[PDB]
C-alpha cells in the first residue's frame, strides 16, 4: 500500500 508508481 502506497505504491511508488503506476508500474505497481
Amino acid at each position, epitope marked *: *500500500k*502506497h505504491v*511508488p*508508481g*503506476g*508500474g*505497481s
Partner: antibody
Amino acid sequence: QVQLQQSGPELVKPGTSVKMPCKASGYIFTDYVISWVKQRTGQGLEWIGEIFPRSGSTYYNEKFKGKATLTADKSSNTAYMQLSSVTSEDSAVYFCARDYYGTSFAMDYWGQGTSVTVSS
Amino acid sequence: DIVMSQSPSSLAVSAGEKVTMSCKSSQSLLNSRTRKNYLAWYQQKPGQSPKLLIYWASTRESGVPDRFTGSGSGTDFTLTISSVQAEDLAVYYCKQSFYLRTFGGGTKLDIKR
C-alpha cells in the same frame, strides 16, 4: 475547485531549517498524494518526493533523503516540507502538487510555489 | 531509476505551424495489467506553475484543447501542438510516474515572427 495554497517567499539563513505549508482544499485530502517539486531560477523541474496523507507514507528522490522531510496533518488538510541545514544550493521555488494516486499518477493541480532564498 | 530524455532542447516555430517534440525513457512506462503508460506532459509559461496537459501518454486533461496531442508507448513518446499560438510559448516537460517520478529536462518552445 481544487486548490493548493502555499506560503510566500522566505529568506532563511544558512544552516537553519525551513518548513513550508501546502494547504489543500476542494477535494478529499486522504484520497490523493501530495508531491513536491524543486525549481531553481531559470532551470528545470526536479522531483523531491511525495506523501500519501491517508497513511503518512513517503517516497523520495534519493538525492533528497535527509534534506527533505515530508509530513501531513489530516485535521488541517495541510502537507509540509521541511528542509534541514539549508545552503545556497537550496535556494529555489518549491511547488507542492496533487497527485491523482491510483489512476493517472499525474500532478493535476499545483500550488503557486514557495520561493526560498538561503542567504546571510 | 528512470531517465527521461527530451529533444530537441528548444524549438522555434511560426504561429499557425505544427510542432513536434520527443520524450524517451530508459525503461518501458507501459504496465501490462493496467494497460497504461505512466507518462505525462506539463506546460510551464514564464512566471507560472507547471500545468498538466496530457496523462497516460495520450489522455488530454480537463479543459485542454485538442490541438495538444500526446502519442507513443513504451519508451518512445511525442507531444504534438497543431496551429501553434503565440500564447503557447512555454517549456514543455515530460514526466514518468511508472516508478517514483522523473521529469525530462524540457523542450523550450519559441515563436518565430
